[PDB]
């Protein structure tokens, strides 16, 4: 038969949930965004298309914090991302209120995962139109995670999603070769700027603005902070040099 892609929680005869796969299309049309895991933290970076010189620079921030130790970035329908993040904040508060310890990164992944999976269960809601990269430092390491509209998520060495995902993945697979003994928080910031710049060539149409954040046991004491100011410029430079 036909018809299997108009409601949400519906199995197609070849076992798929087309509405989730259609949600991925919104993700793929989004901006490219990545995550790199290093020896004691994670870095997050994202491409901010300068639609028009009318946008205030530096001022439409995209990376969001959860609690004090978790960073989240996403590609796709931005307002869905904020929603998921809001839920994440509540979920991180509940956990801390009862257990006192701030929510461990894998435990947070499953909180998000379970919620997003929930929106593939009923035809009275649509799936999340965002893939989300997030992570942080907890009582025993750094953890990077990526989460699809299906609710699928896994832990990564590095991750990418958006229009430039393929350049990013390719450039990240490279990163696991040179620098395999480990990648330090600082080098990972630089490499992040490189990859965003390289991935931007599939969006060369518009000019863009780089935004990086990190969460390093050694460089941020384990708290999630934005790479701004001088260190930011150094990584922007390292991108220009290594692209020419």
């Amino acid at each position: 038969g036909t018809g299997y892609d108009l409601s949400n929680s519906v199995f197609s005869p070849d076992g798929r949930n087309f509405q989730v796969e259609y949600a991925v299309k919104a993700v793929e049309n989004g901006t490219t965004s990545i995550g790199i895991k290093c020896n004691d933290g994670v870095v997050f970076a994202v491409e901010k298309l300068i639609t028009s010189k009318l946008l205030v620079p530096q001022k439409n921030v995209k990376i969001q914090v959860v609690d004090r130790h978790i960073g989240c970035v996403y590609s796709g329908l931005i307002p869905d991302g904020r929603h998921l993040v809001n839920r994440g904040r509540e979920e991180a508060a509940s956990f801390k209120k009862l257990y006192k310890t701030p929510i461990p990164i894998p435990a947070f992944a499953d909180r998000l995962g379970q919620y997003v999976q929930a929106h593939t269960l009923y035809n009275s809601v649509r799936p999340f139109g965002v893939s989300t990269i997030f992570g942080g430092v907890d009582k025993n390491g750094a953890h990077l995670y990526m989460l699809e509209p299906s609710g699928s998520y896994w832990g990564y060495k590095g991750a990418a999603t958006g229009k430039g995902r393929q350049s990013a993945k390719a450039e990240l697979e490279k990163l696991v070769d040179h620098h395999p003994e480990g990648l330090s928080a600082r080098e990972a910031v630089k490499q992040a700027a490189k990859i965003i710049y390289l991935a931007h060539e599939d969006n060369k149409e518009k000019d863009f603005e780089l935004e990086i954040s990190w969460c390093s046991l050694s460089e941020t004491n384990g708290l999630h902070k934005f790479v701004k100011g001088d260190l930011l410029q150094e990584a922007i430079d390292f991108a220009q040099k290594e692209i020419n």
Partner: protein
């Protein structure tokens, strides 16, 4: 579009949300309105629309607090709903925290209110666009609200029918009007020029022009009618 546009809970096979897209079409039929800001003030200019020669001119600007206000283009009722929710948040911030609500944060709250009505069955997206201005602890601010939920901070912009005229003009005049500091009459003049690039067979009158300004030491004030003669 054929089979996939009957509600806000259905994605297109390419990833689109038609119900949200059709909502934007409502804005495009709305009347033009413009916002721009310097480092010290932020200005709204709107072209008010009438129905007959015998009718009033539908109001377009709504104060939200002493430091924040907006202009609307599209379904005026939805602006009532959204601007009224914005008044409540401004007021909550004041009462509970003795803190004026940051323009950036009002923007976040608006996005989230609208996004509820793109994952909810039985609801609909908002059919209106909003230009939000204010002066808070980090200065002048202009936001553009879209029914998708997307709220953006800009130096200037315009929404409504034929808005491209002003939008294009502001893109030229950018480096000039950012610098209009400590001279509000000159920022309004700038805005009234920007909005003119969007008229077609009509010129600005006392009856259809509507202007709001806010900024350092200037609480959000609205000028209509004889007050706006100064600027024509």
């Amino acid at each position: 579009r054929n089979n996939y546009d009957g509600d806000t809970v259905t994605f297109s096979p390419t990833g689109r949300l038609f119900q949200v897209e059709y909502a934007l079409e409502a804005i495009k039929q709305g009347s033009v309105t413009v916002g721009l800001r310097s480092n010290t003030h932020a200005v709204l200019v709107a072209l008010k629309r009438n129905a007959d020669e015998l009718s009033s001119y539908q109001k377009k600007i709504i104060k939200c607090d002493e430091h924040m206000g907006l202009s609307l283009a599209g379904l005026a009722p939805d602006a009532r709903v959204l601007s009224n929710y914005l008044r409540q948040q401004c007021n909550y911030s004041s009462l509970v925290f003795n803190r004026k609500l940051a323009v950036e944060r009002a923007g976040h709250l608006l996005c989230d209110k609208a996004q509820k009505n793109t994952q909810s069955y039985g609801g609909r997206p908002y059919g209106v666009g909003l230009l939000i201005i204010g002066y808070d602890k980090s200065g002048a601010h202009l936001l553009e609200f879209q029914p998708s939920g997307n709220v953006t901070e800009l130096y200037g912009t315009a929404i409504g029918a034929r808005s491209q005229g002003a939008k294009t003009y502001l893109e030229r005049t950018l480096d000039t009007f950012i610098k209009i500091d400590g001279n509000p009459d000159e920022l309004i003049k700038a805005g009234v020029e920007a909005i003119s690039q969007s008229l077609r067979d009509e010129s600005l009158t006392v009856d259809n022009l509507s202007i709001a300004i806010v900024g350092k030491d200037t609480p959000f004030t609205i000028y209509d009618g004889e007050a706006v003669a100064k600027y024509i």
